[PDB]
Amino acid sequence: VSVELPKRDPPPGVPTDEMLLNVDKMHDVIAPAKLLEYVHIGPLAKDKEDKVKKRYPEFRLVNTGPGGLSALLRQSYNGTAPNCCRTFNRTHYW
Amino acid sequence: NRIKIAPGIADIRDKYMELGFNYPEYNRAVKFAEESYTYYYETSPGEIKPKFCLIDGMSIDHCSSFIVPEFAKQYVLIHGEPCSSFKFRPGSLIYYQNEVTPEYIKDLKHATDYIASGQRCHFIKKDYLLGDSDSVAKCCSKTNTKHCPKIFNNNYKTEHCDDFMTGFCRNDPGNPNCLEWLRAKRKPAMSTYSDICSKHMDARYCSEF
């Protein structure tokens, strides 16, 4: 059909910092996140999406970009009085 | 047949694909653009817009191959405007002038075998992105602030470094960075140093505290 197809391969990809982010290791970046603030956690599959939703019930996953690129948006502080009113050092607990 | 590609009057990255079939009115051209530059600036204020049309079903990595790695360390890739690209010419932004338009492309039965839909590359500058506890330690302790977001590198004007510094300053309370963290006069800093000085009240940093 017609003539030979003029194919040209795309340039090799060079991943950036945003795409090389693992949500599992980002527990020290997401915990101090303030309200109304985006914490980009890189690409995310659906299973890891449910796991992250369970792990951070105070946050929301916003699909910022394609390929699973997601961000965490703080919504509320769910800590209770007995757990962080009896201390001044503690800011968050697991 | 007789497929040809040729640069136009505009930038060399923009080209015309001339197609000539048996039908006289199929001897037309399609204006497209493919990227061959590495960006070190911004096309528009606060964003980078490469002419690479990322089609659905391919790695997003290929979208970022046209940016300097040292310049994209504080850029996030977001959803862009819809576009269409040749399946055999991946990442070819096909512009829509005159008869060319996505609905026309979808209408043609043969074009669906050679054109794949997707979105145009888009980047937004936000800040440097941290990814693990070691980078947070480097940024908050101010040992290496080479690539640190303003939230974690603002001389302890915000509550972001409180959790790390709580332990880092128990390790070394006389540190100028720990003392500067205490000058912020927030409750975690003062409670940490109250605990530190309840054991080492005979040390100089307790005088400053």
Contact B65, B91 (CB under 8 A): no
Place of tokens 């829509």: B96
Give CA B114 to chain center in angstroms: 30
Half-sphere CA count of A33, side-chain side, radius 13 A: 25
Tell me whether A74 touches chain B (CB under 8 Å).
no
Contact A23, A44 (CB under 8 A): yes
- DSSP annotation of A65: S
Across the beta sheet with B82-86, the strand order is: B53-55, B115-120, B82-86
Q: Give the span between the Cα atoms of B181 and B162, in whole angstroms.
A: 8
What are the beta bridge partners of residue B75? B125
Method of determination is cryo-EM
Residue-by-residue DSSP string for A72-85:
EEE------HHHHS
> Is B163 within 8 Å of A34 when comparing Cβ atoms?
no
- Tell whether the torsion through CA atoms of B176, B178, B180 and B182 is positive or negative: negative
Contacts of B114 (CB under 8 A, 6+ apart): B86, B87, B88
A34, B89 Cβ separation under 8 angstroms: no
How far does the CA of residue B95 sit from the closest CA of chain A (Å)? 19
Beta bridge partners of B76: B124
**What would the DSSP string read from start to end of B161-204?**
SHHHHHHHHHH-TT-HHHHHHHHT--HHHHHHHHHHHTT-TTSH
B134 three-state secondary structure? helix
Chain B segment 22-51 residues within 8 A of A by beta carbon are none
Looking from the CA of B206 toward its CB, the CA atoms found within 13 Å total 11
Q: Show residues of chain A in contact with B54, CB under 8 Å.
A: 66
CA B149 vs CA A4, A32, B154: distances in Å: 51, 13, 9
Query: Which amino acid, B94?
Result: I
For Cα atoms B174, B177, B180, give the angle at the middle one, nearest 5 degrees: 95
Strands B115-120, A59-63: parallel, antiparallel or unpaired by DSSP?
unpaired
Rg (C-alpha) for chain B, rounded Å, is 28
Q: Closest residue of B to A33, CA-based?
A: B160
Provide the residue type at A7 as one letter. Answer: K
Which of 179-198 (B) contact A at CB < 8 A? 187-188, 190-192, 195
| DSSP-assigned letters across all residues of B97-117 | -TT--HHHHHH-TTGGGTEEE
Nearest C-alpha in A relative to B85: A10
Cα gap B131→A26, rounded to integer Å: 5
- B72 to chain A: which residues are within 8 Å by CB? 16-18
- Strand order of the β-sheet with A70-74 is A38-40, A70-74, A59-63
The nearest CA of chain A is from the CA of B150 a distance in Å of 13
- Test A7 with B88 for CB contact under 8 angstroms: yes
Test A18 with B191 for CB contact under 8 angstroms. Answer: no
Q: Does B160 touch chain A (CB under 8 A)?
A: yes
Chain B nearest CA to A37, separation (Å)? 10
Nearest to B40 by CA among B125, B101, B130: B125
DSSP code, position A16? -
Tell me, rounded to whole angstroms, the distance of Cα B172 from its chain centroid: 36
Instruction: Find, in chain A, the residue whose alpha carbon is nearest to that of B76.
Output: A18
Q: Judge whether B139 and B130 are in contact, CB under 8 Å.
A: yes
Token pair for B1: 């047949």
What b/e readout covers B102-111, taking b as 16+ CB neighbours within 10 angstroms? eeebeeeeee
Our CA dihedral for A31, A32, A33, A35, rounded to 10 degrees, sits at 110
Chain mean position to CA B27: 41
Q: How far apart are CA B5 and CA B31, in angstroms?
A: 10
**What end-to-end distance do the CA atoms of chain A give, in Å?**
64
C-beta of residue B47 within 8 angstroms of C-beta of residue B122: yes
A86 touches chain B (CB under 8 A): no
Tell whether A18 lies on the interface with B, counting CB pairs under 8 A: yes
